[PDB]
Amino acid sequence: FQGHMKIGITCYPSMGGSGIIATELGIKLAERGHEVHFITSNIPFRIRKPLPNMIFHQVEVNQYAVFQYPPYDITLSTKIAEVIKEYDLDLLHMHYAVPHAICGILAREMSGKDIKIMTTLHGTDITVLGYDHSLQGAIKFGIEKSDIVTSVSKSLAQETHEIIETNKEIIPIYNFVRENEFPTKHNTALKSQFGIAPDEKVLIHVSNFRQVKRIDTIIETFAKVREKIPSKLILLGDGPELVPMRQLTKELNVEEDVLFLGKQDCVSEFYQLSDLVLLLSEKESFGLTLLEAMKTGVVPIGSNAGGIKEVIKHGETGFVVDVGDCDSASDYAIRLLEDKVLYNKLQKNMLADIAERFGSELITDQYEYYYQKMLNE
Amino acid sequence: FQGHMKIGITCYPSMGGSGIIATELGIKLAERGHEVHFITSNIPFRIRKPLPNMIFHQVEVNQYAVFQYPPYDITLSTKIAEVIKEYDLDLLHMHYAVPHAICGILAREMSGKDIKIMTTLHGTDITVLGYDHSLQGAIKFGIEKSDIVTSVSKSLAQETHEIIETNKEIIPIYNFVRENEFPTKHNTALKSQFGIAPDEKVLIHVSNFRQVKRIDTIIETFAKVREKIPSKLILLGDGPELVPMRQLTKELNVEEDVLFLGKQDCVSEFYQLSDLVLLLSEKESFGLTLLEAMKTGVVPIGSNAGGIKEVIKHGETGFVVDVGDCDSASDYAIRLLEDKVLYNKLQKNMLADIAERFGSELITDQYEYYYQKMLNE
Amino acid sequence: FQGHMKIGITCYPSMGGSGIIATELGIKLAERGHEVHFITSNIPFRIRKPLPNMIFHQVEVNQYAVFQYPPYDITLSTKIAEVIKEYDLDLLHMHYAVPHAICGILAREMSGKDIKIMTTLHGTDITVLGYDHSLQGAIKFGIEKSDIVTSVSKSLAQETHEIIETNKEIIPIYNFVRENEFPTKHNTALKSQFGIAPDEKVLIHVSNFRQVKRIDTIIETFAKVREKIPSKLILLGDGPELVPMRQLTKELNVEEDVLFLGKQDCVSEFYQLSDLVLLLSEKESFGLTLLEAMKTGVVPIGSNAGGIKEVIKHGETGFVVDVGDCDSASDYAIRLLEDKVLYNKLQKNMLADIAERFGSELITDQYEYYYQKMLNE
Amino acid sequence: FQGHMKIGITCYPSMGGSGIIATELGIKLAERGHEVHFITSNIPFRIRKPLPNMIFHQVEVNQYAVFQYPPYDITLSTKIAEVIKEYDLDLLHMHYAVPHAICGILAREMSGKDIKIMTTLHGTDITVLGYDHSLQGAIKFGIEKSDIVTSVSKSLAQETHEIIETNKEIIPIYNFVRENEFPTKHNTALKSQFGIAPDEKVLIHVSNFRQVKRIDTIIETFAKVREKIPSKLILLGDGPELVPMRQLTKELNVEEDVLFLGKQDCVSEFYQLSDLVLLLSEKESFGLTLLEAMKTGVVPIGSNAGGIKEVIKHGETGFVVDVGDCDSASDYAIRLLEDKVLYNKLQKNMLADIAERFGSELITDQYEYYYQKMLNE
């Protein structure tokens, strides 16, 4: 270890798992005593306590009458460059090849200092290219001009090499949750408040309600489970598929047993009253909602898309089914909700496995290691 | 006919066929003596000559430090409402259910006058819903609160009823080209300038280079044609697939015979040197580039997506193939480039057919008819 | 009182005082048992605990390849309309004439129900019109078609009548802070962490660093205070003037005594170690940072812009100076930092005055009263 | 001269004088035989004829569900970099320090080739900094990392050195009009169409209707002229001040003599029927509308803001008044509309002066000269 580092972090602090990961990583590094600078647009964050060595820099992105589009990329690069000059930063940690790796590359030019840049891929660069190949060259450049590139799963590293066609080494470093924010415990005080009887089994799904999440499979799965087991499906979040999914609960005549609770700041309290977590996505590079529930003690059922099959060990820590397979998913779910022996076995394997592979201290050490490798090249 | 009308038109004047259609329709109505007001954002237009009775109102969409996003919808509605009050408009003709039908509905509220609203669907509302169902309710509302709804093909009207689930009557009114802008003629003066020998056959495709256009099928088709016939493929336009398509011409070793000419203001001069026009799209509600080429005398080969199979009469005015079928497309193309008798026969049927179904005077009469029907309800 | 209400609230949850006010008002109403629905774009919020009767609906604003600008206004109106239909809302509370009053007016149309709409003005509609009169008609319409319009100060109500020229009644209802989030207490544990000696006086300013905040006057004021009194100026926040203001501290040779701490989630802990709060803005309709500091026990010095001179009672609860008058501001500040008798007197008047005029229970009662007045008209 | 150059040009083709200048410069260079590539966003342009050596590359700027803002800067830089690689460009000519100089600087990095970059300042970088200092560092960097920087007037070069504080040399190169697009002639055929009697004097103003244009001074000036001389004021364009200015014509009771004609594609035909052109702006780095009218034969009255007093030679080719001075402006205007001897004298000096200083061939030669100087450094 070469020691204390001055670190600039850029992400979208309010978008999905990537914003949580980048913020919590920054907090962990700050608690060890690194000097951590966040540089994001005018978007809020979740920071429990102020630390003298952790600063949130925020830039306002305004169109004037001069620009055709609000100049996010240039405004953010300028701000990062100003933080580099003012605080003599050692390195940048950018989340996403676009826009943020390019923003860091531009900021290094604007700052005059040859700062090192780590870029972490979360899968959004693959998503973008599924709609539109305009940014293919930018994604490739942001990957190849970063000093080190990481990915939140091995599946994502392989898919990136396929789709972007680069020989750049991509280092898989998994996601983590902060153990103190997700106590392994089970509560029922909140269960009554939301109209769930103590003898009802609770299935939970937490997402942005995009089509890629296949909440249609989740609701189809729940309807089959509901036939055999009195239960509730809790859906946390909001997004594009909200209304189609609400109508699907009426077609399957399960409307009174599906609770659309909206967006929640404190998801751990809802995991604590849950029995099963579902993530049946078509594409998923990691699936932070699974690890959050698993850390709480909730056993997972996932699809075999992307990194979900790295998070869940099929048959040991939970179950993995094919994308779209509501028959198998409801079979596994009914078993787990009937069979305390299976549930307790997977749950105890799961709590041990996530501590060995996804511990916040272990993962921070991995990131910190590659920070110093960058600085010594 | 009840006579002279005061008409407000809103479109995106620079986006694809819809902007051309809405602008040329407005010009035709202005030439008959209607008072025509365009109300669009700060985007240029193509207007040949000023008319005292045709005014272009343009609104600037600025973010300040106050809005999170540039308030296009509200700014435009406000501007339309101001034009309604100042000039006592009789009706609005909005292009797209979103945003523009909603903008007209809001502007009618803001103006205080019960103006009538026609909305023309171009298919972009189906495109939007393929990505994201957030706007499903807005699209349905914009359709159902318009006084009359039209669509640029019968295929689009049926697909709308399927996907939006409304009993609203949708009136098919086809697209047109301005006959004087597309003379039926064949030139070769420009052919040499662009490095095309007089004995070379020319295939032309004109689009926005989005994936839905299947320019991969077009280039695969050309490579098969190139085996038997010395020829050039001219690709007009630019967009997301430019670089992947350029690389595909190197894989098929046809790179020197594919001309990527970029965006062109004056496409008729390129149709005039062309022998075949191709539009092999996966989704296409009309296909204005086909009618433009056909009016020039160029025989078309299209896919059977959407309205293309209404524009081309398969076997009579051109050929229609299955989406992706480069084998059949190259068969038809080689025939047409070898066989003057087939070419001349389809060409003469085509010039007669487009005059009977897509004449600018006929189509303007159809729109003008439904304007007056709205005003008399 | 007519009782329980189903309420939809729309604001920008992450922009300045307006987002805090609208969120905390919603929380207070939810704690009394009203059914409270927030409907905002994909922007985070600060909600301490989940309540079964408080739902956060969040809409994703995406450009496709179809829109020129991300359709915030229409997307949000659609979402509000869906919440109206699904939960049979009684009323909407929109913050800002633009965009949100217009969004609520459009959503009422889209929902089919004649819901009542309250709109609260925060001054941003005056700001917008200082740059650009495009939205003048929209602001006037949003005010005049709301069922009730409020303003966060009397100054703002008068300035609105001047600049928008409407006979609409605007009801002044002041801002508030949540008393439990801002305990009246003084800590020094955090003071050492940030390198402030126990015998140093602390001046604090909290803002978005826009030019209208006149942080140049604040820093000029501090430099004069620093001549007579060992002290630190803490600047919380970030924004456009950060770099010019940092350079101004070098010109005045006070750089080591000005602490640029960045954006902070938990400002109350910094107010708790502060002795004076400064808000010397050119335009300020209320000034939520003053009330937050005052509730903590910190005595204020403000300009006489807008509502600041309604929040501070000059000579009784703090001091008010002319915009730009760093001479007077430093005079008042040196006095307050030398004179415990003056400080304690103003502080005790201030704590009593803010409880009588700005108490969260009192203000919520005022809003709740006008909600029911709307419903009974 | 070192000869033929491969040139990439980036501007906003639809925004004011800068878009006209950059496009016409590119056309002039293409007519001499340079290989000219335009690279802009999905915004139309005005190109009279296709040239094999002039290509318009256009990039689509889409938000997905992944970006918070449409990534204009990165999308455009990527596209420029692709054109650099594909066509082996020698140099970039970027218009505006932000965003376009930064875009070219980023594209040079992305391309791998050390291309030279000229940046032309038009004054928008000063405008931006009047609202908001966030981009100060970006503007300075874009200026200092360009190989050559030009400005459209000497006033703008001096104001830039004041406000940005750089020792970078800025080369003044004036704007021009294309002589063939603005024939020196006077028509009256169009005058009747727009309801102007043959014996009426015509004053014309052409702008974007922003506040900086002081159309209030122009209308106040016209009202004084109207007292002594039967005349019409033609206002071409549209924008934020349209409605306030229309109301000002009612207060001054000149409403029937002010013609709000909207946006016009073909302004030369309106200059041809005009007697006086007015540009009384508070800030104006050149004023392309003046040169267009002057080339048509119309004598100008301007303010002394920025470059207007370089375009107009006060007393020799027209008159210059203080910003806001409607008394002097109406004095000069009444004289010029009464006095054929003065009018003819200034008109003949003006036509000679604009040919010596602002000829399209001369200005293109100046740009071409500095292109080659860049390439030889």
Ligand SMILES: O=c1ccn([C@@H]2O[C@H](COP(=O)(O)OP(=O)(O)O)[C@@H](O)[C@H]2O)c(=O)[nH]1
């Ligand atoms: O109402 C919600 C919905 C989601 N999330 C968080 O958003 C993140 C989503 O991460 P994941 O990887 O599961 O999905 P992504 O959104 O990245 O696809 C998780 O931390 C969730 O806890 C949340 O805090 N509240």
Ligand SMILES: O=c1ccn([C@@H]2O[C@H](COP(=O)(O)OP(=O)(O)O)[C@@H](O)[C@H]2O)c(=O)[nH]1
């Ligand atoms: O370089 C170009 C490319 C396209 N177009 C025009 O854009 C329109 C495209 O219409 P179409 O219906 O073919 O496709 P869309 O873009 O609407 O999908 C046609 O009028 C084309 O002539 C053009 O003028 N220049």
Ligand SMILES: O=c1ccn([C@@H]2O[C@H](COP(=O)(O)OP(=O)(O)O)[C@@H](O)[C@H]2O)c(=O)[nH]1
């Ligand atoms: O780092 C910061 C800076 C500001 N604020 C909050 O932002 C709001 C600003 O409100 P105010 O009325 O003072 O100013 P505005 O931003 O509305 O002009 C206050 O609640 C501040 O506590 C904050 O929480 N953290």
Ligand SMILES: O=c1ccn([C@@H]2O[C@H](COP(=O)(O)OP(=O)(O)O)[C@@H](O)[C@H]2O)c(=O)[nH]1
């Ligand atoms: O209806 C209009 C209004 C303006 N313009 C053109 O927009 C440009 C404006 O340039 P100028 O330098 O006068 O003003 P700017 O907009 O750059 O401030 C001139 O070429 C005008 O001819 C136009 O073509 N049509």
Ligand SMILES: CC(=O)N[C@@H]1[C@@H](O)[C@H](O)[C@@H](CO)O[C@@H]1O
């Ligand atoms: C659909 C998808 O791939 N989303 C991923 C998610 O799997 C991952 O947990 C998150 C944090 O790394 O980044 C992305 O949002």
Ligand SMILES: CC(=O)N[C@@H]1[C@@H](O)[C@H](O)[C@@H](CO)O[C@@H]1O
């Ligand atoms: C892919 C698609 O459906 N585009 C259509 C196009 O077919 C049609 O010609 C144009 C004008 O009506 O509108 C849309 O852009």
Ligand SMILES: CC(=O)N[C@@H]1[C@@H](O)[C@H](O)[C@@H](CO)O[C@@H]1O
């Ligand atoms: C500069 C200005 O007027 N900002 C006001 C602020 O005074 C007020 O406290 C806040 C909440 O009502 O709304 C606005 O942001």
Ligand SMILES: CC(=O)N[C@@H]1[C@@H](O)[C@H](O)[C@@H](CO)O[C@@H]1O
């Ligand atoms: C207000 C202002 O400075 N606008 C200038 C204009 O003077 C100039 O003619 C144009 C072209 O160089 O660029 C800018 O738009």
